[PDB]
Amino acid sequence: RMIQKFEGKKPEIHETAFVHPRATIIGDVEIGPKTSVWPGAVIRADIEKITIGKNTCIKDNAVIHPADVYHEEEIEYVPVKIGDNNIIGHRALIHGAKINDESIVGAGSIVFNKAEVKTNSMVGMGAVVLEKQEVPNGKIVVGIPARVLRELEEREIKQIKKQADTHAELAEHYSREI
Amino acid sequence: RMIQKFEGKKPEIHETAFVHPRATIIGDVEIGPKTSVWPGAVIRADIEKITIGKNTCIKDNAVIHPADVYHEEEIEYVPVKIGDNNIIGHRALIHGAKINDESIVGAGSIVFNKAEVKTNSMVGMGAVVLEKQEVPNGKIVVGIPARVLRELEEREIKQIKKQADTHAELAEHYSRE
Amino acid sequence: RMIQKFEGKKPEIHETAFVHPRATIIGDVEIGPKTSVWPGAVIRADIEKITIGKNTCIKDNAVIHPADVYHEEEIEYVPVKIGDNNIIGHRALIHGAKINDESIVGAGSIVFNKAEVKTNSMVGMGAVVLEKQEVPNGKIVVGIPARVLRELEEREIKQIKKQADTHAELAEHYSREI
Ligand code: NA
Ligand code: NA
Ligand code: NA
Ligand SMILES: [Zn+2]
Ligand SMILES: [Zn+2]
Ligand SMILES: [Zn+2]
């Protein structure tokens, strides 16, 4: 319901995506099929693009915003790219960062400017992934700053895709009730 | 303004409870007398039940959601249960966990799946109570993950109930406008 | 949209300030010129005043609330006071605190009761500035609790004002559409 234009850029949302009325999608946003956006989530693509893939969960009160960078006298803007089968947890912040496929950004965590969360990895709850930091494949990072705790079990990795499916099926049932 | 059905289940909100119109309540929610829910708070009972008791405050941008837990084949859904006289702080997350009576969940903190905040305890600000962890009676926990800092002094415990009453009174004044 | 009145007192918002429809402003709030408030932000001046200066940014899902401090008998209510050219970051909490001029409160951080963020200082992401804690002029604090990390370089301080202007200009373009 709050699908807002900005500078004549309107969100492109796939017809099988679900955006809850209490989420806020602004500007140059792209959302793929079966991707869900939940109450209070703000996806604000005003200063640069936000691209979200298919079958991804943007959980409640999560904020997604491109970065404005001031290390050069000319101001620079970094887009957000989020891949497929991801869980962006309750109250997580994705700030000018890249999330690849089948990964979990834990609840309340921050993934900051030019960072990259690689496929089949986890950002731990409340963790802060710093500027340009890389979360490696098959690992979980925790704390502030985010540091590697351990490798993920092969079951833990396989249940990410299963979580993405569960939450996409949930979103489908929301869609059926206007 | 956003009390929403889900799969036939409607939020059962007591008449003396206050839900700010900018809060979001969905599905199988039970909210008791004098309990307040503040702007941006999301209480989403779609995958399981959320039960909140009486005189409890769910402060701004707090999120309450049942847990989906993934066993070898079955998916376990874990309901949220929050008791009486609690302060769920600004931007806190209660996720498939249990809060008992007269406790403070501090601002920005997380109480995770299957965790338990016992009566007369505190989760400190920004702390993360990991799954199946108990915050014991009469104690504060801090940091990530949450670990015991010290005992709550006798005065500190009595001011929890007093704070809950102050916030329930504040909500009463919101209801009249 | 949600500029709510409380107990007779209505938000006093300058004509050049910008409040996004999805922000919530309640009660005894004072907002200076060129200041911007963004989706999901809550500025709730109900138990005491909140004063925000000019050219300041209250980013998405940020919460500003006065403090209720509990003494042996009486209850003290502490106002929020936020100065000029500040950045209150995505999902930050300013709770009964004082923020002076040209500072950054980092994303997801807490500035709690009777605390003070001095001019040209910086609260790190996910940090928790405790009760009555000062964030000193020229310095950056991090972690839980908030510990001084280092002095800010002269270039970094110069970019605080520039970031405030960039976001004030952004808000200007939002206000020209609706
Ligand atoms: Na189906
Ligand atoms: Na009364
Ligand atoms: Na201009
Ligand atoms: Zn931003
Ligand atoms: Zn959840
Ligand atoms: Zn408060």
Place of tokens 């938000």: C11
Three-state DSSP at C123 gives: strand
Report how far ligand 6's centroid is from the alpha carbon of C141 (Å). 23
| Distance separating alpha carbons of residues C49 and C30, to the nearest angstrom | 8
8 A C-beta contact, residue C61 and residue C41? yes
Tell me which residue of B19, B91, B96 sits closest to B56, measured CA to CA. B19
| Distance separating alpha carbons of residues A157 and B4, to the nearest angstrom | 34
Report how far ligand 4's centroid is from the alpha carbon of C178 (Å). 21
**Around A95, how many Cα atoms within 13 Å sit in the side-chain half-sphere?**
27
**Beta-carbon neighbour count of residue B79 at 10 Å?**
16
Report how far ligand 3's centroid is from the alpha carbon of C166 (Å). 10
Sheet holding C57-58, edge to edge: C18-19, C36-37, C57-58, C87-88, C104-105, C122-123, C139-142, C147-151
| Distance separating alpha carbons of residues B128 and A82, to the nearest angstrom | 25
Between chains, do B44 and A60 touch, taking CB under 8 Å as contact?
A: yes
Give alpha helix (H) positions in chain A: 154-175
First vs last Cα of chain A: how many Å apart?
12
Structure tokens, B96: 């498939």
The strand pairing partners of B139, in sequence order, are B151
8 A C-beta contact, residue B59 and residue B20? no
| Distance separating alpha carbons of residues C158 and C178, to the nearest angstrom | 32
Ligand nearest to the CA of B168: 2
How many degrees, rounded to 5, is the angle at CA B156 between CA B151 and CA B161? 125
Tell me which residue of B110, B62, B58 sits closest to B82, measured CA to CA. B58
Burial (CB < 10 A; 0-12, 13-18, 19+), residue A11, is buried
Is the CB of residue A128 less than 8 Å away from at least one CB of chain C?
A: yes
8 A C-beta contact, residue B75 and residue B96? no
Report how far ligand 3's centroid is from the alpha carbon of C137 (Å). 31
8 A C-beta contact, residue C149 and residue C131? no
Three-state DSSP at C36 gives: strand
Structure tokens, A116: 């990259």
Resolution (Å units): 2.6
8 A C-beta contact, residue B146 and residue B136? no
Structure tokens, A43: 């996806």
HEC string of chain B equals CCEECECCECCEECCCCEECCCCEEEEEEEECCCCEECCCCEEEEEEEEEEECCCCEECCCCEEECEEEECCCCEEEECEEECCCCEECCCCEEECCEECCCCEECCCCEECCCCEECCCCEECCCCEECCCCEECCCEEEECCCCEEEEECCHHHHHHHHHHHHHHHHHHHHHHCC
In C32-120, DSSP assigns E strands to 36-37, 42-52, 57-58, 63-65, 67-70, 75-78, 80-82, 87-88, 93-95, 98-99, 104-105, 110-111, 116-117
Domains (ranges, CATH) in chain B? 1-177 (2.160.10.10)
Structure tokens, A49: 């693009």
Is the CB of residue B107 less than 8 Å away from at least one CB of chain C?
A: yes
Is the CB of residue A38 less than 8 Å away from at least one CB of chain C?
A: no
Between chains, do B40 and A38 touch, taking CB under 8 Å as contact?
A: no
How many degrees, rounded to 5, is the angle at CA B44 between CA B102 and CA B171? 50
Number of H helices and number of E strands within chain A? 1, 22
* CA nearest to A40 within chain C: C40
| Distance separating alpha carbons of residues B84 and A82, to the nearest angstrom | 40
How many angstroms separate the Cα of A83 from the Cα of each of A28, A49, A80, A96? 16, 14, 10, 14
8 A C-beta contact, residue C134 and residue C115? yes
Structure tokens, C128: 């928790």
Tell me which residue of C90, C99, C4 sits closest to C43, measured CA to CA. C4
Three-state DSSP at C133 gives: coil
| Distance separating alpha carbons of residues C13 and A154, to the nearest angstrom | 55
Burial (CB < 10 A; 0-12, 13-18, 19+), residue A8, is exposed
- List the single best residue of C9, C37, C73, C93 to mutate versus B (max B Cβ within 10 A): C93
* CA nearest to C146 within chain A: A144
| Option in A39, A107, A167 nearest B95 (CB) | A107
Compute the count of residue pairs across chains A and B with CB atoms less than 8 Å apart: 72
| Distance separating alpha carbons of residues A91 and C43, to the nearest angstrom | 18
Q: Give the method used.
A: X-ray
| Distance separating alpha carbons of residues A4 and B174, to the nearest angstrom | 30
**Cα four-point dihedral sign A110, A113, A118, A119:** positive
DSSP H or E segment with residue C170 = helix C154-175
